[PDB]
């Protein structure tokens, strides 16, 4: 009977894990929309037919979207823990009365975890042509991280049912 009662704390831990992953997925949707807009900006900027004013405008938009990405990444926390802001290598949620834990490996979404730096930009059309591939790689790794987080959440759900 004491074991059956400790199953409650187990269930509460698994639910906390799904909540943290939900906040991370919301931040991930924001970051992915911003990354697609940044790729469109760098793509338009790569053109050499643009004049200086249009190029500066596209550059300023790219920088502003960069700052919004880092802000959305830092703001993604659930009650002071986070699995996406890169503040910890891992998080471990309970799985049995004996204390064995389900493990979730953190997937960073901050600019440094995407491979971008906080001050990355392009000052010339050739730099924009490089930035297209840079943003594409960043979007790819971001989507892979979010997909792994989604699988971890579904696994926590299935274990919750089995614990019940």
């Amino acid at each position: 009977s004491a074991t059956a009662n400790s199953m409650n704390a187990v269930k509460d831990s698994l639910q906390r894990g799904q909540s943290t992953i939900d906040v991370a997925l919301a931040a991930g949707d924001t970051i992915t929309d911003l990354l697609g807009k940044m790729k469109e900006k760098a793509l338009a900027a790569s053109d050499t037919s643009l004049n200086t004013a249009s190029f500066n405008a596209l550059k300023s938009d790219f920088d502003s979207l960069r700052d919004q990405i880092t802000k959305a990444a830092s703001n993604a926390k659930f009650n002071g823990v986070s699995i996406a802001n890169g503040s910890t290598a891992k998080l471990t949620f309970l799985a049995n009365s004996d204390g064995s834990g389900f493990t979730v490996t953190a997937k960073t979404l901050t600019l440094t975890g995407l491979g971008l730096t906080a001050s990355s930009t392009f000052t010339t059309a050739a730099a924009a042509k490089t930035m297209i591939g840079t943003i594409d790689t960043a979007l790819q790794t971001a989507t892979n991280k979010l997909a792994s987080l989604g699988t971890s959440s579904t696994g926590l759900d299935t274990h919750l049912t089995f614990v019940g």
């Binding site: 997925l25 979007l139 989507t143 892979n144 979010l146 997909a147 792994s148 987080l149 989604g150 959440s153």
Partner: protein
Amino acid sequence: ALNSINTNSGALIALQNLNSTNAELTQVQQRINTGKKIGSAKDNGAIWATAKNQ
């Protein structure tokens, strides 16, 4: 046991089945609301990442 009053195993099994019913209903409601069978990373991470990049 058979005629226990402390315990009610049949109610336990019926509750688990009702919970599975409500889970299926919630999934179908989400699928009607968003109009997508994969609306999130949770639905299928591989196909979701693929569609997002495309």
